[PDB]
Amino acid sequence: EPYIAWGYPNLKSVNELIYKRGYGKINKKRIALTDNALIARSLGKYGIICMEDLIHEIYTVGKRFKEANNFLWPFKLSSPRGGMKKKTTHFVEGGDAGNREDQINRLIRRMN
Amino acid sequence: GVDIRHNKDRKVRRKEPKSQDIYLRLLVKLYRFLARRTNSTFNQVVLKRLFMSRTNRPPLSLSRMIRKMKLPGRENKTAVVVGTITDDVRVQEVPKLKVCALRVTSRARSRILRAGGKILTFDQLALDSPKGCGTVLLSGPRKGREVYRHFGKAPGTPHSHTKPYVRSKGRKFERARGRRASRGYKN
Amino acid sequence: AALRPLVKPKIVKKRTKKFIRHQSDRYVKIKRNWRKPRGIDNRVRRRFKGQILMPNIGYGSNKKTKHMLPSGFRKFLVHNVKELEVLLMCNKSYCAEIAHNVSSKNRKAIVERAAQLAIRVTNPNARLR
Amino acid sequence: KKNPLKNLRIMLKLNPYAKTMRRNTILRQARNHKLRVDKAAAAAAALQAKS
Amino acid sequence: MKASGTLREYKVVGRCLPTPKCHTPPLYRMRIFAPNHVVAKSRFWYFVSQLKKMKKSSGEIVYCGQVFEKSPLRVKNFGIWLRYDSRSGTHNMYREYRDLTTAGAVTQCYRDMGARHRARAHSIQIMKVEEIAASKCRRPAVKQFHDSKIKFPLPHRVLRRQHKPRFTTKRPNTF
Amino acid sequence: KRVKENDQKKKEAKEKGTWVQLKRQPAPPREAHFVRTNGKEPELLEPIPYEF
RNA sequence: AGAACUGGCGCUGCGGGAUGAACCGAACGCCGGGUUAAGGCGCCCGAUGCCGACGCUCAUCAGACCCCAGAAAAGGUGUU
RNA sequence: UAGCCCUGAAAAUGGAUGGCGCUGGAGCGUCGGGCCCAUACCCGGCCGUCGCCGGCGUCGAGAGUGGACGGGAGCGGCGGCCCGGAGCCCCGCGGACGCUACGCCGCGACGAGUAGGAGGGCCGCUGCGGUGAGCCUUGAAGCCUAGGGCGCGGGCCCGG
Ligand SMILES: [Mg+2]
Ligand SMILES: [Mg+2]
């Protein structure tokens, strides 16, 4: 909790991170996930052969959440264009380092 | 910065032989073509053994090859070894087996051919069986070297069996203390 | 306008200032040839700001632009006629230098041969009468 | 890599329903616009009919 | 808490999880003044854990909603009760303000405890707040504005410097 | 115990054709339930004053 | 002076703390655009040249930003 | 009772909120909105390294991730007097580059460093075996240079 910032993402936060900062690992590299042939070939075993079927198993946490999430490369996000508040104390305490439960969606729209 | 690794991350196998033998380089150009084009794992094992050292390619005696091909099923396959075939004096008769090696020795290749056998190289192995189909590939005893019985824990360690480096085997050469219960201790 | 190559790109170079040795301004026993300084307390090996930059592999020039002359050719120094005819099939990408050794009589014949084969020589007006 | 959410038909190479999701919402907020522009006029037209 | 900007009132109710020993716990109510609904449901567990044996892992909140005032356009008198910590000890304190809204008077208190007593926003607890009427006020800074036909001028007015030309030939009259 | 009550429950659904999913999960987030405050009101509590 | 756990310095530049081994941010191939971290925005000195909000304070020794580079008991019908 | 200010409160060259300086603040407390910048973060270019591969098909005829023939029966599409059958290149004789295989090409991630350890050097010096039908009194070596450049660098080539 001193080092992360987290909360519960809504439906176009989970959409804006896939369509803009979406990247996969087939064997071991980060490819830009341009085609539905890049999801179906590596992860069509699980019935989730396209892009919005990838996003359905990651918003509603489905039966195949583990393999769809581990397919996605971790989102290499930009630094926030508003600026952070104090970075070293909790979001309750005045800073921003912890659980903020839906304000995280206000932060993703500046990070992304 | 990203992580806190110790940087292994440079794989320390061999990608080509250190040998400058131009005949052995032609086998590599034969088989690293086959390894990337035939979808067989025979041609990946043969290709990585052509890379290997003279230590990691041990010889194979002619009596292990006929011991490891009198098994059930092996009667009409080929003996493959990336390495040399010396003969055993200890064996009395030789069957009519079909072999394939880099460098069979002179006495061993006289005894295979008297018994009706057939020696191959890796060139005419590739034209007969490109996939490696119908082959029994073998290896010699790579821990058969005298070097490996000096390797272990340490000779003074209890329950070691590790053969110390002595300049002459005999009485008075590393036998007194640390080797018997009278003179001090036994390890 | 004289003999033009194939396609010439724009030659960027990452630095055009010729890495000089440290403390070489201060001493005339120290030539400007770069040696990297392996001392313990020096501030150039330790890479402080505002001081002598030290070379590494990041300054390396583009692979399709390395060793290009500013005319867009790439030199290859010759000595006589017969190793100037080895360059007939590269006359639009590679150019010739007549070496510093070749005399002014032989230099006349290997510049008038490269006119026929349409090979550019970078020093055609050297050692003339 | 081009940007879906920024250009069309890179969405539609990845999500074909995103076009008919988009003209079904450009139509209805063009008719909700007409429903509110005519409401503001025809209310204050009868108000302009009085005075 | 930081108490950033204007504060905001919250009605936060909550109960502890149903045990084999007590089905249907009584589900208490509080009145939280907080900058947003994440600090409000945090400070709910700060005060409830001081009074009951409830804590956030063995409880849940069932509603956290912003309760706002029922007369934003009516000038009211707010006397509030505080429990700040000082450098030596801790003190109880009654303290009046005067504002259009409930939530802005307690904003005006944190701005005033920090000003007059150097009391940071974490070391201060709000006991209760209500609108009081005139003739029940004690504080004469609040009491002096209880004046039908109140009137005063604005002496010595000063504002808008460098927004006008930074160099002029004109000495600015202060009315 | 849960190699005993797993294998007797594995064949218990093999004879009945279901999808019991005998692999354990850790404590999930709580179900969307519906509390009742029947009749009465939520009791107001306030922080008490300080005394020694 | 001597130990425990973790990080760092030594081996390590960079932004900030005026100054600096170790503090605070952040670790570094060569560059362009963007955005921030810690810290700041009268002028040295980039940026408040906002018609910033509420109060407190007068010092003939005022105060002024982690480490951190100066103070205590006791007292004041000085003011809140 | 506790906020700020005051007394308590004295040291040796002249001096330090960093300085100038500031008192409707440039002080202290509580906060707001803008704004300023690091080698950090994101997007792009390039270099190198690591990893994972591609290409012997230069196959303008290879056409291939299931193909044969050839027999006994069938529908569509083709040229009819409701019966019917391979045409193998051609009016153009043509068709870029490439694969030092120890070379070329692709994709992705990474890059601090003392002591220390490895790899590459088409870095440099002196001599030997081979080799350039090398090079020169129409000027070698050496040395000089506000001359022209090349390489990340070691260094090098050229001009006078
Ligand atoms: Mg040092
Ligand atoms: Mg810290």
Side-chain angles (χ1 to χ4, degrees):
Chain A
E1 62 92 20
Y3 291 166
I4 67 175
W6 67 286
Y8 313 124
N10 61 0
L11 205 148
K12 73 166 286 291
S13 292
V14 79
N15 198 12
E16 192 177 2
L17 295 170
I18 300 301
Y19 287 165
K20 186 172 183 294
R21 300 293 175 95
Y23 287 115
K25 47 180 278 187
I26 301 104
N27 47 11
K28 298 172 296 295
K29 42 184 168 281
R30 63 188 283 269
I31 45 96
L33 64 186
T34 169
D35 289 332
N36 290 325
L38 280 78
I39 298 174
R41 185 177 176 179
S42 67
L43 179 126
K45 302 186 263 76
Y46 298 140
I48 49 181
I49 62 104
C50 72
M51 191 69 64
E52 194 162 356
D53 203 356
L54 186 275
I55 212 159
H56 182 264
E57 295 291 323
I58 208 157
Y59 177 65
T60 62
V61 179
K63 187 179 179 293
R64 294 294 188 188
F65 184 78
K66 184 175 183 179
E67 293 89 8
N69 196 3
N70 203 1
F71 172 73
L72 288 174
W73 198 269
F75 299 97
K76 296 172 77 68
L77 298 178
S78 176
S79 184
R81 68 172 180 271
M84 288 183 285
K85 290 186 262 74
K86 181 61 189 296
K87 206 189 79 177
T88 60
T89 55
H90 196 203
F91 182 79
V92 175
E93 197 176 2
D96 62 353
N99 194 1
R100 60 178 84 187
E101 294 180 349
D102 45 353
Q103 304 297 318
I104 197 73
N105 300 320
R106 187 180 289 174
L107 180 137
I108 288 171
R109 268 55 160 271
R110 291 186 290 114
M111 293 284 288
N112 198 3
Chain B
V2 47
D3 53 353
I4 48 94
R5 76 273 196 251
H6 311 290
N7 281 316
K8 272 88 177 66
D9 73 350
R10 181 179 66 84
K11 305 285 102 173
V12 62
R13 64 262 173 101
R14 301 181 70 171
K15 297 281 100 176
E16 77 272 12
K18 288 175 97 289
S19 175
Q20 302 295 322
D21 191 0
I22 60 166
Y23 287 98
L24 194 145
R25 291 297 181 96
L26 290 171
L27 269 71
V28 175
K29 291 162 65 172
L30 182 65
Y31 276 90
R32 75 170 66 199
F33 174 66
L34 286 174
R36 72 111 192 278
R37 196 80 188 279
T38 200
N39 202 5
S40 289
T41 321
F42 181 84
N43 300 112
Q44 289 182 357
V45 171
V46 174
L47 189 271
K48 72 180 181 181
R49 289 176 189 269
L50 291 167
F51 292 163
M52 288 182 185
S53 58
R54 175 74 159 264
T55 303
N56 294 320
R57 292 184 292 107
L60 179 55
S61 66
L62 193 271
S63 68
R64 297 182 78 91
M65 182 175 284
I66 64 173
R67 189 172 67 184
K68 298 295 188 293
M69 287 187 74
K70 285 177 72 175
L71 273 306
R74 269 86 181 276
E75 69 266 11
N76 282 316
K77 294 178 180 182
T78 66
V80 180
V81 52
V82 188
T84 68
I85 302 171
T86 62
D87 58 350
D88 272 356
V89 167
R90 283 91 58 88
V91 72
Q92 304 299 323
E93 68 177 1
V94 178
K96 60 179 296 296
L97 80 169
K98 180 183 285 186
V99 304
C100 182
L102 275 68
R103 191 184 170 271
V104 184
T105 66
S106 294
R107 290 178 68 191
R109 75 171 68 201
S110 69
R111 296 181 71 246
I112 299 168
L113 298 178
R114 288 187 294 110
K118 178 175 172 61
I119 53 97
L120 279 76
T121 63
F122 281 181
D123 310 334
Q124 49 190 352
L125 176 62
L127 289 176
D128 183 71
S129 64
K131 297 283 189 180
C133 54
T135 60
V136 178
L137 84 95
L138 292 166
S139 179
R142 66 171 63 242
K143 285 196 185 292
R145 297 174 68 239
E146 189 174 358
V147 187
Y148 285 94
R149 65 182 68 251
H150 295 289
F151 292 159
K153 298 180 99 287
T157 293
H159 297 283
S160 62
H161 304 88
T162 316
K163 192 180 173 66
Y165 295 94
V166 291
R167 79 265 193 94
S168 66
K169 184 189 283 289
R171 187 192 66 83
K172 88 180 75 172
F173 294 102
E174 276 81 357
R175 289 179 189 270
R177 68 171 291 269
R179 298 293 302 277
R180 58 182 58 243
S182 68
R183 268 62 174 263
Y185 62 94
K186 188 182 286 186
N187 55 359
Chain C
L3 289 173
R4 293 177 65 92
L6 279 180
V7 290
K8 58 181 292 183
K10 269 68 69 181
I11 303 99
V12 297
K13 286 186 182 296
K14 301 273 184 67
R15 183 186 172 91
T16 54
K17 289 294 290 295
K18 187 76 178 177
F19 287 102
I20 61 168
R21 198 176 195 267
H22 179 64
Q23 297 282 316
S24 68
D25 53 345
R26 194 180 290 264
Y27 292 102
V28 286
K29 67 185 177 183
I30 292 169
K31 297 181 183 180
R32 62 97 180 260
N33 305 116
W34 173 255
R35 307 289 189 263
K36 73 171 292 182
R38 294 179 182 89
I40 47 177
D41 284 338
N42 52 353
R43 59 182 200 258
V44 176
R45 183 195 61 78
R46 287 170 63 190
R47 202 180 299 120
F48 289 1
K49 67 177 184 292
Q51 293 163 10
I52 294 172
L53 293 177
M54 60 194 293
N56 51 8
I57 204 65
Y59 293 94
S61 68
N62 196 355
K63 285 170 94 288
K64 294 190 291 294
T65 321
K66 190 176 176 73
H67 295 284
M68 294 280 279
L69 266 64
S71 67
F73 284 99
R74 292 183 177 180
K75 51 184 278 181
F76 175 75
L77 72 91
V78 304
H79 295 89
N80 44 2
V81 179
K82 288 177 73 174
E83 74 182 9
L84 186 272
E85 293 178 351
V86 82
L87 197 62
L88 175 61
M89 288 295 107
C90 294
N91 55 357
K92 295 177 73 68
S93 180
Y94 294 147
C95 67
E97 282 188 351
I98 304 170
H100 75 286
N101 295 118
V102 181
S103 64
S104 67
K105 176 178 67 66
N106 295 112
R107 190 164 299 190
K108 185 176 178 180
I110 73 172
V111 69
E112 293 180 357
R113 178 59 175 165
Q116 295 176 356
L117 298 174
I119 301 165
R120 182 188 289 274
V121 48
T122 62
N123 49 5
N125 48 5
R127 299 178 67 181
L128 79 163
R129 305 299 178 93
Chain D
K1 170 173 163 59
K2 295 181 179 179
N3 196 12
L5 275 69
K6 190 174 289 296
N7 61 355
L8 196 72
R9 204 182 304 166
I10 300 297
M11 280 288 281
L12 271 61
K13 193 183 293 187
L14 277 61
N15 190 0
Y17 187 76
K19 187 173 77 174
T20 188
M21 187 186 285
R22 187 167 293 180
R23 69 259 182 100
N24 284 323
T25 196
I26 297 167
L27 260 64
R28 72 178 181 268
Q29 75 190 4
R31 73 178 71 248
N32 282 121
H33 182 271
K34 183 179 288 294
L35 193 148
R36 291 183 63 187
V37 167
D38 186 72
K39 184 180 285 186
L47 190 148
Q48 193 266 330
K50 182 261 291 180
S51 64
Chain E
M1 193 177 73
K2 189 178 174 64
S4 69
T6 178
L7 296 173
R8 188 171 294 113
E9 190 178 4
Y10 287 96
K11 186 177 80 172
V12 187
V13 295
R15 54 94 169 260
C16 60
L17 276 306
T19 60
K21 187 173 175 65
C22 182
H23 290 279
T24 68
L27 56 92
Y28 300 101
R29 183 174 72 92
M30 289 197 68
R31 192 186 181 187
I32 307 298
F33 297 98
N36 54 5
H37 70 280
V38 177
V39 184
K41 66 172 70 176
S42 175
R43 294 295 297 274
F44 175 77
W45 297 109
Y46 176 62
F47 296 108
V48 170
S49 64
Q50 289 184 358
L51 297 174
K52 304 303 300 299
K53 300 295 284 289
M54 291 178 180
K55 73 200 294 188
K56 188 173 76 69
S57 67
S58 70
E60 78 273 21
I61 70 164
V62 295
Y63 174 76
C64 177
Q66 177 176 358
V67 42
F68 30 73
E69 71 274 14
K70 295 287 105 180
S71 64
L73 301 180
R74 179 182 171 183
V75 182
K76 296 176 284 295
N77 295 308
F78 294 96
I80 68 172
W81 282 265
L82 307 179
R83 194 184 174 178
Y84 73 100
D85 291 330
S86 65
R87 297 172 186 177
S88 66
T90 166
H91 301 283
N92 292 315
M93 173 179 279
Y94 173 76
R95 172 72 68 183
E96 295 180 353
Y97 297 101
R98 179 164 161 84
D99 195 359
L100 283 80
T101 184
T102 65
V106 74
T107 299
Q108 186 171 356
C109 179
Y110 287 157
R111 301 292 184 267
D112 191 72
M113 283 295 108
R116 282 191 170 92
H117 301 283
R118 305 296 187 268
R120 275 77 179 171
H122 62 269
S123 65
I124 174 167
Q125 296 172 359
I126 308 297
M127 289 192 281
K128 63 187 176 70
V129 178
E130 75 270 12
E131 52 178 357
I132 60 175
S135 67
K136 288 188 258 76
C137 296
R138 273 85 66 84
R139 303 284 92 92
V142 178
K143 191 183 289 292
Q144 69 180 357
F145 294 95
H146 295 94
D147 192 2
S148 179
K149 293 170 71 173
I150 185 169
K151 60 184 288 293
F152 51 88
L154 272 305
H156 196 190
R157 297 290 293 269
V158 279
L159 199 61
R160 193 190 299 116
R161 285 80 180 85
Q162 299 88 245
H163 177 84
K164 282 173 96 290
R166 192 177 179 94
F167 309 104
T168 180
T169 80
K170 197 175 184 183
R171 302 292 286 261
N173 54 352
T174 64
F175 185 76
Chain F
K1 61 94 180 174
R2 62 180 289 274
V3 66
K4 183 184 264 79
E5 63 93 22
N6 201 0
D7 297 334
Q8 67 93 31
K9 189 262 293 294
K10 191 181 288 183
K11 60 99 175 179
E12 197 272 333
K14 183 184 285 288
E15 63 94 20
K16 192 260 296 298
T18 52
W19 185 63
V20 64
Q21 300 308 108
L22 46 92
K23 189 185 289 186
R24 63 188 175 179
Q25 301 303 108
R30 287 190 296 272
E31 191 270 331
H33 61 98
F34 194 91
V35 315
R36 186 177 294 163
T37 176
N38 45 4
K40 65 176 71 66
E41 57 97 26
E43 199 267 329
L44 177 65
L45 50 86
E46 55 95 25
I48 45 94
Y50 179 75
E51 292 296 325
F52 181 78

